[PDB]
Amino acid sequence: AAQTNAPWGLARISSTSPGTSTYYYDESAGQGSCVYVIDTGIEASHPEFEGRAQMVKTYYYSSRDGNGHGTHCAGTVGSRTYGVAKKTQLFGVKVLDDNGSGQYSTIIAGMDFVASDKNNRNCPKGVVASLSLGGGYSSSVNSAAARLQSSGVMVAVAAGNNNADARNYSPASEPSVCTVGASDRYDRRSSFSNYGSVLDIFGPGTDILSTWIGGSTRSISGTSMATPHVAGLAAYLMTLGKTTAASACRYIADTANKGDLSNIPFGTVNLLAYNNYQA
Numbered sequence: 001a002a003q004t005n006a007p008w009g010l011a012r013i014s015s016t017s018p019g020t021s022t023y024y025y026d027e028s029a030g031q032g033s034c035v036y037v038i039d040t041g042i043e044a045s046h047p048e049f050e051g052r053a054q055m056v057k058t059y060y061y062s063s064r065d066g067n068g069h070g071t072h073c074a075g076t077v078g079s080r081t082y083g084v085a086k087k088t089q090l091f092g093v094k095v096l097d098d099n100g101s102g103q104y105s106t107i108i109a110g111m112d113f114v115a116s117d118k119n120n121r122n123c124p125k126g127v128v129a130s131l132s133l134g135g136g137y138s139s140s141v142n143s144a145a146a147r148l149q150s151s152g153v154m155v156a157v158a159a160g161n162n163n164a165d166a167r168n169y170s171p172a173s174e175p176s177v178c179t180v181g182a183s184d185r186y187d188r189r190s191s192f193s194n195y196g197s198v199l200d201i202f203g204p205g206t207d208i209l210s211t212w213i214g215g216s217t218r219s220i221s222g223t224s225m226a227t228p229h230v231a232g233l234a235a236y237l238m239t240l241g242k243t244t245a246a247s248a249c250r251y252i253a254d255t256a257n258k259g260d261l262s263n264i265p266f267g268t269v270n271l272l273a274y275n276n277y278q279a
């Protein structure tokens with residue numbers, strides 16, 4: 001399948017070169033997979049989700065996304081126009097308030113929630129969790145992300161936006177999950193992207209168009225935007241049968257575009273997520 005005039009990040013993940021604008025992908029499109037978006041919520045009524053999104057848990061007075069951040073990330077995973085895996089099922093877990101903030105204890109509870117809740121959902125092709133959040137190093141936060149991964153969920157986490165070594169942030173620094181840095185449309189490391197040995201992969205993170213609350217759209221930047229590209233890619237590849245939740249991060253690194261990004265610090269992987277789809 002070909003989506004013309006796609007957001008640059010979608011075109012990038014199906015291309016061996018920057019500077020194109022069509023997204024190419026197998027029509028299975030993540031059907032039969034599920035992606036949890038652990039964030040500020042999801043505006044499931046947005047036409048772009050086509051009834052495939054729902055809120056499953058909140059720790060606050062509403063499950064609605066009063067911020068936009070979670071809706072944007074969910075849109076990059078699986079919206080019809082802005083998403084990588086256009087037929088996946090999206091499940092929202094609201095661990096962040098409408099200002100985008102949340103306590104680590106709540107974030108930990110949300111991760112353990114997903115590890116159990118997947119047993120209440122139909123995801124025959126596999127389960128992914130996208131975590132576009134983080135803070136300073138916490139062994140307990142890292143352990144929760146490790147548990148979620150161990151339970152059979154492909155965990156993708158944002159590296160962080162401090163232009164710093166991600167070893168000092170959580171869940172970014174957890175070795176067993178997939179830690180995602182951000183790149184721009186010219187294949188440069190995004191100016192804010194964290195780096196370091198703990199990163200596993202880069203995805204598009206600068207000027208990313210996706211869904212927003214109020215049935216709208218907007219373009220924003222962050223490792224929060226790169227993470228759902230990788231989460232959606234994992235769901236798409238699991239639906240194709242090419243990998244599993246336990247192996248998807250390594251498979252994405254194995255099949256990535258290699259050595260094509262600029263301003264990657266010595267010691268950080270130079271790997272850009274790529275779907276290797278041959279039309």
Ligand SMILES: c1cc(CNc2ccc3c(c2)OCCO3)ccn1
Nearest residue numbers: 133134135158159160161169222224
């Ligand atoms: C790991 C990941 C994160 C999430 N990073 C992030 C999220 C949203 C953002 C952002 C940066 O930068 C600008 C505003 O939007 C924060 C801390 N550690």
